[PDB]
C-alpha cells in the first residue's frame, strides 16, 4: 500500500514523493528501491429549565445620589447572587412603538426581574463587579 504511486490521465504511473513518471508497471515497482526514493522517504440549558419562577412582588427604593438603587429581596438560601444587566427596549413580548430607551434589570433565581428605564445615555456603570453589592446577612442588594 504505497500512498505515493498514482495513475495519470495517460495510462502511466506517477510518484508524487519524488515526482517521477513511469510508462509501464514494471518501472513503477522498480522505482521504490534506489537512492532518490530513499532520500525522499527519509526527508519526508439545564439551569434555565430547572429555575422556578413564581414571580413575587418586588419593592425597590430608588434615590438620586450625588458624588443608587436598594432592592429588598427575601432570603434565597443559595450562593447565586442577583445579577444586573442593561438592555435595549427593541426586544419585547409585544414590541410597542416608540421604544428607543434602555432598561437596567436586576434578576435573581427565586425572584422576578425588576427593570428600571434610564432615559439618559450614560450616567453610571451597569457592571456587576464594579459598583454593586449584595449583603447576604441582611439580604440587601445595592447598585450605584
Amino acid at each position: 500500500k504505497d500512498p505515493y504511486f498514482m495513475k495519470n490521465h495517460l495510462g502511466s504511473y506517477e510518484c508524487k514523493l519524488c515526482l517521477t513518471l513511469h510508462n509501464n508497471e514494471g518501472s513503477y515497482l522498480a522505482h521504490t528501491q534506489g537512492k532518490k526514493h530513499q532520500t525522499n522517504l527519509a526527508r519526508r440549558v439545564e439551569v434555565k429549565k430547572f429555575v422556578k419562577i413564581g414571580r413575587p412582588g418586588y419593592k425597590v427604593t430608588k434615590q438620586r445620589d450625588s458624588e443608587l438603587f436598594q432592592i429588598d429581596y427575601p432570603e434565597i438560601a443559595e450562593g447565586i447572587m442577583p445579577r444586573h444587566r442593561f438592555m435595549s427596549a427593541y426586544e419585547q413580548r409585544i414590541e410597542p412603538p416608540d421604544r428607543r430607551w434602555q432598561y437596567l434589570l436586576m434578576a435573581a433565581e427565586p425572584y422576578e426581574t425588576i427593570a428600571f428605564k434610564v432615559p439618559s445615555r450614560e450616567i453610571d456603570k451597569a457592571e456587576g463587579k464594579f459598583w454593586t453589592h449584595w449583603n447576604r446577612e441582611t439580604k440587601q442588594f445595592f447598585l450605584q
Binding site: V45, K48, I53, R55, R83, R85, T113, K117
Partner: peptide
Amino acid sequence: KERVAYAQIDWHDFVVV
C-alpha cells in the same frame, strides 16, 4: 457558577413598577 447563572436567566421578563 455566577457566570453560568447570569447567561441562563431570562432577560425578556421586564417589569416597571
